[PDB]
Scaffold this active site. Sequence first.
Site, PDB file in Angstrom:
ATOM      1  N   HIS A  52      49.096  29.032  41.050  1.00 40.69           N
ATOM      2  CA  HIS A  52      48.167  28.332  40.166  1.00 40.69           C
ATOM      3  C   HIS A  52      48.372  26.827  40.291  1.00 40.69           C
ATOM      4  O   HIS A  52      49.522  26.325  40.360  1.00 40.69           O
ATOM      5  CB  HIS A  52      48.334  28.722  38.686  1.00 40.69           C
ATOM      6  N   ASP A  55      51.161  25.783  38.179  1.00 41.10           N
ATOM      7  CA  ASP A  55      52.486  26.138  38.610  1.00 41.10           C
ATOM      8  C   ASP A  55      53.149  25.007  39.414  1.00 41.10           C
ATOM      9  O   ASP A  55      54.408  24.834  39.478  1.00 41.10           O
ATOM     10  CB  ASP A  55      52.507  27.384  39.526  1.00 41.10           C
ATOM     11  N   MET A  86      46.783  31.862  49.730  1.00 43.27           N
ATOM     12  CA  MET A  86      45.937  32.035  48.548  1.00 43.27           C
ATOM     13  C   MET A  86      46.401  31.060  47.519  1.00 43.27           C
ATOM     14  O   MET A  86      47.605  30.732  47.395  1.00 43.27           O
ATOM     15  CB  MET A  86      46.027  33.486  48.052  1.00 43.27           C
ATOM     16  N   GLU A 179      39.566  38.977  40.366  1.00 42.42           N
ATOM     17  CA  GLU A 179      40.602  39.921  39.987  1.00 42.42           C
ATOM     18  C   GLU A 179      40.254  40.552  38.648  1.00 42.42           C
ATOM     19  O   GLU A 179      40.269  39.744  37.686  1.00 42.42           O
ATOM     20  CB  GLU A 179      41.887  39.122  39.927  1.00 42.42           C
ATOM     21  N   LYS A 181      40.774  42.998  35.269  1.00 43.14           N
ATOM     22  CA  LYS A 181      41.799  43.498  34.330  1.00 43.14           C
ATOM     23  C   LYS A 181      41.095  44.045  33.109  1.00 43.14           C
ATOM     24  O   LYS A 181      40.117  43.399  32.658  1.00 43.14           O
ATOM     25  CB  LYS A 181      42.809  42.365  34.016  1.00 43.14           C
ATOM     26  N   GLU A 215      44.645  44.550  41.328  1.00 43.10           N
ATOM     27  CA  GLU A 215      46.110  44.682  41.091  1.00 43.10           C
ATOM     28  C   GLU A 215      46.459  46.095  40.656  1.00 43.10           C
ATOM     29  O   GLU A 215      45.779  46.603  39.758  1.00 43.10           O
ATOM     30  CB  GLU A 215      46.553  43.619  40.075  1.00 43.10           C
ATOM     31  N   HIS A 218      46.809  46.551  36.944  1.00 46.85           N
ATOM     32  CA  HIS A 218      45.582  46.389  36.162  1.00 46.85           C
ATOM     33  C   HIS A 218      44.727  47.670  36.136  1.00 46.85           C
ATOM     34  O   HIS A 218      44.264  48.118  35.050  1.00 46.85           O
ATOM     35  CB  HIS A 218      44.810  45.222  36.703  1.00 46.85           C
ATOM     36  N   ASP A 243      46.959  42.598  44.969  1.00 46.90           N
ATOM     37  CA  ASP A 243      48.152  42.282  44.217  1.00 46.90           C
ATOM     38  C   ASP A 243      48.986  43.575  44.019  1.00 46.90           C
ATOM     39  O   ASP A 243      48.453  44.542  43.461  1.00 46.90           O
ATOM     40  CB  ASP A 243      47.892  41.700  42.839  1.00 46.90           C
ATOM     41  N   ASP A 253      50.615  45.167  30.326  1.00 45.41           N
ATOM     42  CA  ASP A 253      50.942  44.979  31.806  1.00 45.41           C
ATOM     43  C   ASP A 253      52.454  44.773  32.026  1.00 45.41           C
ATOM     44  O   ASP A 253      52.963  43.731  31.547  1.00 45.41           O
ATOM     45  CB  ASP A 253      49.996  43.899  32.389  1.00 45.41           C
ATOM     46  N   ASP A 255      54.136  44.645  35.142  1.00 48.05           N
ATOM     47  CA  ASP A 255      54.470  43.783  36.299  1.00 48.05           C
ATOM     48  C   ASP A 255      55.794  44.212  36.918  1.00 48.05           C
ATOM     49  O   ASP A 255      56.551  43.303  37.307  1.00 48.05           O
ATOM     50  CB  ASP A 255      54.544  42.286  35.950  1.00 48.05           C
ATOM     51  N   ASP A 285      52.469  40.418  42.746  1.00 47.84           N
ATOM     52  CA  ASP A 285      52.273  39.763  41.443  1.00 47.84           C
ATOM     53  C   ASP A 285      53.116  40.548  40.476  1.00 47.84           C
ATOM     54  O   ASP A 285      52.587  41.542  39.983  1.00 47.84           O
ATOM     55  CB  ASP A 285      50.795  39.718  41.162  1.00 47.84           C
TER      56      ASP A 285
HETATM   57  O1  LIG Z   1      47.336  39.054  37.145  1.00 47.35           O
HETATM   58  C1  LIG Z   1      47.594  38.011  36.611  1.00 47.35           C
HETATM   59  O2  LIG Z   1      47.935  38.354  35.489  1.00 47.35           O
HETATM   60  C2  LIG Z   1      47.697  36.726  37.359  1.00 47.35           C
HETATM   61  O3  LIG Z   1      48.966  36.482  38.042  1.00 47.35           O
HETATM   62  C3  LIG Z   1      46.399  36.690  38.290  1.00 47.35           C
HETATM   63  O4  LIG Z   1      46.630  37.459  39.549  1.00 47.35           O
HETATM   64  C4  LIG Z   1      46.198  35.254  38.866  1.00 47.35           C
HETATM   65  O5  LIG Z   1      45.883  34.407  37.765  1.00 47.35           O
HETATM   66 MN   LIG Z   2      47.450  39.649  39.389  1.00 50.77          MN
END
Ligand SMILES: O=C([O-])[C@@H](O)[C@H](O)CO
Ligand SMILES: [Mn+2]
Lengths: 385, 385, 385, 385
Positions: A52, A55, A86, A179, A181, A215, A218, A243, A253, A255, A285
Site C-alpha cells: 500500500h 505502507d 503489484m 479483490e 471480500k 483471496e 475471503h 492472494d 479473517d 490470515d 496476504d
Molecule cells: O485483503 C486485505 O485485507 C488487504 O491486504 C488487500 O489484499 C489489499 O488492500
Molecule cells: Mn488480500
Amino acid sequence: YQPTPEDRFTFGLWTVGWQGRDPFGDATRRALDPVESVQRLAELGAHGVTFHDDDLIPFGSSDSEREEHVKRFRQALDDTGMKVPMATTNLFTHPVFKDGGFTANDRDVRRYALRKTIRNIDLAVELGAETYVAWGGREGAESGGAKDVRDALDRMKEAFDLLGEYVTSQGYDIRFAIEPKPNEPRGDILLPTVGHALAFIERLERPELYGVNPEVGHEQMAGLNFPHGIAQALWAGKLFHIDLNGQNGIKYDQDLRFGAGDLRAAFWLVDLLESAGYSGPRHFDFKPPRTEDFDGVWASAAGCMRNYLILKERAAAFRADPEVQEALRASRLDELARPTAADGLQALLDDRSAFEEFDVDAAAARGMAFERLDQLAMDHLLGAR
Amino acid sequence: YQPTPEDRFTFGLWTVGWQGRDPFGDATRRALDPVESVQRLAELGAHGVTFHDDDLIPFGSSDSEREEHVKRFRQALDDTGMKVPMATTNLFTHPVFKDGGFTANDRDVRRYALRKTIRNIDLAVELGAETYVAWGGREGAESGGAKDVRDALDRMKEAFDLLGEYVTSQGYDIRFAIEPKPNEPRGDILLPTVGHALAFIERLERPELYGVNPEVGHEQMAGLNFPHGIAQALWAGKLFHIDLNGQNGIKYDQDLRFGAGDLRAAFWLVDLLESAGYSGPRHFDFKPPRTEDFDGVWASAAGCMRNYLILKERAAAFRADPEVQEALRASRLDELARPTAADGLQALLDDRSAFEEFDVDAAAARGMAFERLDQLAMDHLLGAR
Amino acid sequence: YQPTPEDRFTFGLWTVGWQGRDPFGDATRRALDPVESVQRLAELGAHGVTFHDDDLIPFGSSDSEREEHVKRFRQALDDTGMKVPMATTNLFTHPVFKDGGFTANDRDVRRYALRKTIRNIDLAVELGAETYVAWGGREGAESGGAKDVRDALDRMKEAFDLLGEYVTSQGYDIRFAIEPKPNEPRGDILLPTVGHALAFIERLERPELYGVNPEVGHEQMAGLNFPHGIAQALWAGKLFHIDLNGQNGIKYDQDLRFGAGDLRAAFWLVDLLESAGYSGPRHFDFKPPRTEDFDGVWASAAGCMRNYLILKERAAAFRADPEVQEALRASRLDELARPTAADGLQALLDDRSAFEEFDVDAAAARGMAFERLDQLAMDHLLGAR
Amino acid sequence: YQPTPEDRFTFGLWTVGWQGRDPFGDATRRALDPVESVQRLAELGAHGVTFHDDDLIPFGSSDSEREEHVKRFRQALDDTGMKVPMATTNLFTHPVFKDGGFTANDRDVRRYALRKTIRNIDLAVELGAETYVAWGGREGAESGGAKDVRDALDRMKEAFDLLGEYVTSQGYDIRFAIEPKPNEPRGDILLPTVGHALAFIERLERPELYGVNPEVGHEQMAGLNFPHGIAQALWAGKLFHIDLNGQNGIKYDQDLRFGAGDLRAAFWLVDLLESAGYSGPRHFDFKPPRTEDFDGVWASAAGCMRNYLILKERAAAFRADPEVQEALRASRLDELARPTAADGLQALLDDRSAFEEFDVDAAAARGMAFERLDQLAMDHLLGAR
Ligand SMILES: O=C([O-])[C@@H](O)[C@H](O)CO
Ligand SMILES: [Mn+2]
Ligand SMILES: O=C([O-])[C@@H](O)[C@H](O)CO
Ligand SMILES: O=C([O-])[C@@H](O)[C@H](O)CO
Ligand SMILES: O=C([O-])[C@@H](O)[C@H](O)CO
Ligand SMILES: [Mn+2]
Ligand SMILES: [Mn+2]
Ligand SMILES: [Mn+2]
C-alpha cells in the site's frame, strides 16, 4: 522444498510487518523498516514485495520525505534483486474513509479517494508493478438505509472507469485487479465474492483492463469452494493475481499462513494453478499470529512457501500417476471435456438415442467411482501411496 | 392485508404440494392433486402457479397420460383465472441426474438433460409462461477430482447456448432465469451465488436472453446480504424473476414461509423491489413445515402473502416520512446519487480541493448519522412511530 | 495400513446401507441385507456393527418376524466374529415423531417413544452392546412459540431418568451416550453441542450412567473445534463413544468418509484420542455419496479405516520426534501442565513476583514459537520431515 | 417507550466509550471521560454502568492516580444515582495476555492474571457490584499443538477455584458469571458456548458461586438459537447476568445495538426473560458504529433501550391475547408442561395404550398447528393484529 526467486513468491509489506494490533489488543511487535523486510524476505527465497501507498510512505509525508522513503526502498530492491509486481492503495485505515473511498456518501471524499489512488498508480508504474490491486474494504454498510446499492455501484463503476481513462491516457502498462471480500470491516462489503467482481467488470467501459485478485480466506468467509471460484475466474480469463493464506471456516479473517486452514482446499488450489499454468505472482496476504516474536514471523513466512512447494509436488505426483489417470477415465472426466452436441441442435433433436430410446435406468445404475478417485488424491496428499 | 391477483403472488406446485419427506423422515402428508392446489391458491388470492415438468406429468407418462394431465390442469386454470408465468425442468430427482444434468460427466446424460428441458419449454410456451427457470441443483461435486470446473462451465455454456438457439429458432417469447445455490444437495454447486450467475451470463452467445432467479434462502446459506445481491441484479438489468422464502442463517435450506427467518432483510428486500418498480411475479418457493396438516399448509401459504403486504406498507410509510427524508439528507444519500466527477478526469486532476487543499480531518469528523436513520427504519417496521 | 478387528473399527448398518435418498432425489442404490453388510464389513477388517431398532427389524414387524430377523443377524455375527458394541433407537423417521420423541408436545407420543426405546435396550443387552446412543434429531423447533425449552428440558430429563431407573432395575450393564447436533432436521435441535449435553447430564438423577457420543460433522456444523470439544468431554470423564466422519464447514450434514472434510482437524482428533488412550469403538457414522455404486460403497468404508490408520501413524511420529519435544518445551507446553498456585492462595497474595515486581514488558516480549511448532506438525502430517 | 432506572438498563464504559479502532482502521472518535459517560447515560434513563479495571484506571496507574480516578467516578455516581451492578477484569488487551490470562502457557503470566483479577474484585465490592464477569477472550489457540485443552481446563478450574476461595475467605457477597465466546480474537476460544460454560461450572469446587453471562452476538457467531441457550441457563438456575446486542449471523462480532441483527430472536429473547421473571441487569455490550459522531453514539445507546421496551410490549400483548392462548392449546403447549409418566415406570411398562394398542397413524396425522401460531407471533411483533 527450498524456494527460489523463480517460484514467483511475493509478500506484502503489511504481512510480515503486521504489529499484532487486533480489535481486542495492543501491538505485540515493533514496527519493521520496509528495507529490513526486503532484505529478510530476499534471504528466505522470495521473488518480490508489494505495498500500500501508506505502507511505504507515512500518511501525510511531505514531498521531500516521500522521495527519501522511495529512494531507500529502491536501494534495497537494487541490493537484493527483489521486484515489485503489484501495488495498491490504502482506502481503509484513515478515519476519512469510514464510509468508503470510491462509494463514500460524501462526494468530496470520493474525489479524494481517486486522487490518492492516481498518485500511487504513478509510483507503482515507476517501481515496475504490472498489477494494481483494489480492495474496497470500507465500501458497504452496517444498516439497510445507509447505502443505496444501485447508486453505490454507479459510483464504483465511475471510479474504475476514470482510473481506466487515466492509465490509457498515460500509456501505462498496468492492469487492475479487484479483490472481493464478503464482510469485515463493514457489516457487508460490496462485490462480496469472485462472482460479483467478475459480473461487475463486464459493465465497465474497458473490461479488458480489469480482472480479479481473489483471496483464499475471503471466499472461505462465505463458506465457498475457493478452487471452484478460481476455476471460474480462469474460465473468464480474469485471474490477474491471487492472494494466498489460510482460514478455518466462517469467522473473522484469520490470515493464517498458506497451507493452514483448509489443507485439502489448498491441495486442489495448487493442483489447479499449476495445471492451468497460471504465471502471475504467488502472493501471500497473511499475518504471523500476534503470539509470535520476529523469529516466529520469519518462520511463518517461510512455511507459506514450503507448503506451496510440498503441495505442488503432491499434486504433480497425483496427476502423473497412471493409476490416477485410469481412475479419471473410470469417472468419465474425459467425457466431461467432450462437447455435448457438436452435431448441433437439429441433430440433437432428431437423435432418438438422446430421448425416445435412452435407457435412463442403465445410465442411472452406473457408479461414478468418485470415492476411489478421492482416496487416491488423499493417499497422494499424505504421501501414503 | 388481503391479497388480490393484482399483487402478482405465485406459488410452485411443489411448495404447498411438499409431502414432508426430509433426509431423516417419511412423508407426513398425502400428495395433493395439482387441480386442488390451483383451486385452493386461487381462493387465497394468488395470481398463478409454476411447475417442474415432473410436478405436473409423472415421470414416465405416456403421450396419452401426458395430454390428460395437461387437459385437467388447463381446465383448472380456466375455471379460476390462475396464470402460469414461469416453468422449469426437474434435472435433480431421478437417479440418472446423480452427477448433474447439463454438466454430468456422462455425455449421454447431458444430451438427455437437454432433450427433457426442450420438451418442457414447448409446454411452458403453450401454457403462457414468460420465464423459464434453470436451477442446476446437481451441477457440482463432493470431491475435488470428480469435476473439472473449467470443463464443466464449458458444458454449462454449451447447454444454455443450445437452449437460446432453440427458442430463437422457434420464435418463442420466453427468457431464461438461472437460479444460484451454494450447496445442497451437492457438496458445492456450480454458480453458487447471484454474482457467479451474472458473470456466467456475460459469456453466453446471446446474453440478453438470460437473467437470474435469486432465492432468499439460497444467498443466505452463504451468509450474504440478499437485498445487496438483488440491487446488483437490478443494476445489471437481469432480475427476471425472484424466489421468496425465509432462512435462519447458514445451514440446510429451510424454505420457511416469507417473512420468517431474517425479518429485517425481508423489510429491506420489499423496500427495494417496490422502489425499483420490479414488475415480475412475487413467487414463493417455500415448504410448509412437515409438523403441519393441510390446514397448516394453507395457513403457511397465506402468511407468505400477508407478510409481503405488511412489509410493503411499512417500507412505503418509511420512505414517505418527511423525518426519514430529512434523515436521508443528513446521511448524504442525496450525495451518493451525484456523479463523483462529471467535470471529468482532467478537471479532477487540476482540482486542488480534491487533494492538495482537501481538509481530511474536517471530513473525517463528520458523523454519518446512520444509527438515527436505522432506528427510524426500526420504528417504522415495528409500527412504533 | 490394513485394519484388523483389534483397531476397534465399527460401522452403523445405516451407513454402508444408505440408499442415497436426499431431500432432492430418489434412492440410487438397492437396499442391503444386514447379513450382507456384516459379511462385507468383516472382510474389510471391521470389528463390529451398530444398529437402530428399525434398521434391523422393519417397523411394524410381528413378534415372529422380529425373532427371524434377529436370528439371521445373530448367525452372521457368529459366522464372522463381528460384535455389536452399541445400539440406538430410531425416534426420527416415522411421521408420529414429527415434533420429537421424548419432547414431543403430545404426551401420548412421549410415552410411545419411551416404550419403543425400552424394547430395544433389552435387545441391545441381548446382543452384547455396552453403550446405548440417544440422538434426539426431532427434539426442537422451527418457530419460537412451538416449544417451551424449559418444559422440554423437563420432559427430556424425565425420559432419561426413567431409562436410568429401567436399566438399574434390570441390573443391566449398559450406559447411555447422548449425541448432540445443532440443527437438521429441526430448525434448531435441543442440546445442540457437546457442551450443552455435558451440562444437561449433570442434572440427571444418576449422572454416572450418562456420557456423550459426539460426531465430527455435528460440532463442525456450528463452526466449533471438534478436538477441543472432545478434550472437554475427556476432561469431564464422559467420552463414552464417538462418531467419525467428515464435513466441509457450516452447511447440511455431509457425512463424508472420515479424513475428508477438515483434514487437519482429523489429525488433531486422532492425536488426542490416541494420546488420552480412548478405548471405546472408533465408530463411522458416514454415507457413501449417492454418486456411488456398491463398489464405491465398500471403497468409501475402507477409506474411513485407512485414513484413521494413516493419521495415527503421523500423530505418533509427531509426538515421538525429539525436535517436536524440544519445540513443545520452547512453547511452554510443559509449564501449562504445572499448577498455577500449588503454594495456595495466601502465598499467591504475598508473592511480590506475581504482581508488585512482575516485569510485564519482559513477559510480553517472549515469543510463543507456535508457528514453528505448527509447521513441524504440518511436515509430519504430510510426510515431509 | 421511555426508560427509567427501574428497567434496570446498564451499559459498559467501553461501549459508548469505544473510539472506533477496528483491525483495519484508526479511531474515529476521541476518548470519553468515564464521568461524562455516567452523566450522559443517566440522562438517557439508564440504571447503571459496568467497567473493566482498565476502563476506569489506566493500566499502570500509581496508587495515588488510582484513588483519584475512583474518587471522581464515585462523585459522578453520587451525583446521578447510577449504580455499578457488575464489574470485570481486562485480561485481553495488554501484550502480556497474548496467549491468555488464566490459561497462558507461561505460569508467571497465569499468576499475574489472578493477582490483577483479585485487586479488581476488591474494588468491585467497594463500588457495590453483585456480579463479577469473566470473559477469557485470549484463552484458546490458532493451532492444534499450542494448547493442550485438558491441561488448559485444569488451569482454568484452578483459577476459578482460587477466586472462589478468595471471595469466601473475605466474606464477599459477589458471584462469578463466565462469558462464553466461540472465537475472536483467538482462532478458537475455550468454553466456546453457554453449554460448555455450564458444564465446566459443575466441575468447580463451589459450583453455586458461578453462573453464566451469555451474549446475544457470541452464541449467534456459532449459528446457535440464543433464546434456546438462555432457556437452558434458566433451567439450570445459572443466568446471573446477560449481555444484549445484535449480530447478523456467523462473522466477526458486530456488537450492533440491541434489536438490530436478528429481530425475531430479539423478540423471543425478551418474551423469555420477561415470562421467566429474570431480575438481573439488562446490560448492553454494544459498539456505536465507527461511522458515528458523539450524537450517533447517544442515539445508538438510546435505541438499545427503546427496542427492548417495544419488544416487551409486543411479547406481553402476544401472551395476553386469548386467540394466542387458544392457539397454544391447539399446538399442545399445555401437554408439553405435563409429566410424561408421573404414574411411574412400572405403570408405563404395563400400559398397553402406550405401545401394544397405541394408534401411531392417528397420532402421526394430527397437525401441530405451529404455522398459525407463528403467524400470530409475527402479527403481534409487527403490530398488525
Ligand atoms: O485483503 C486485505 O485485507 C488487504 O491486504 C488487500 O489484499 C489489499 O488492500
Ligand atoms: Mn488480500
Ligand atoms: O430452489 C429450488 O430448490 C427449486 O424449487 C428451484 O427454484 C426450481 O427447481
Ligand atoms: O447422527 C445421526 O444422524 C445418527 O446416525 C445418530 O448417530 C444415531 O441416531
Ligand atoms: O464481550 C466482550 O467482548 C467483553 O465486553 C466481555 O463482556 C467483558 O470482557
Ligand atoms: Mn428456488
Ligand atoms: Mn451420528
Ligand atoms: Mn460481552
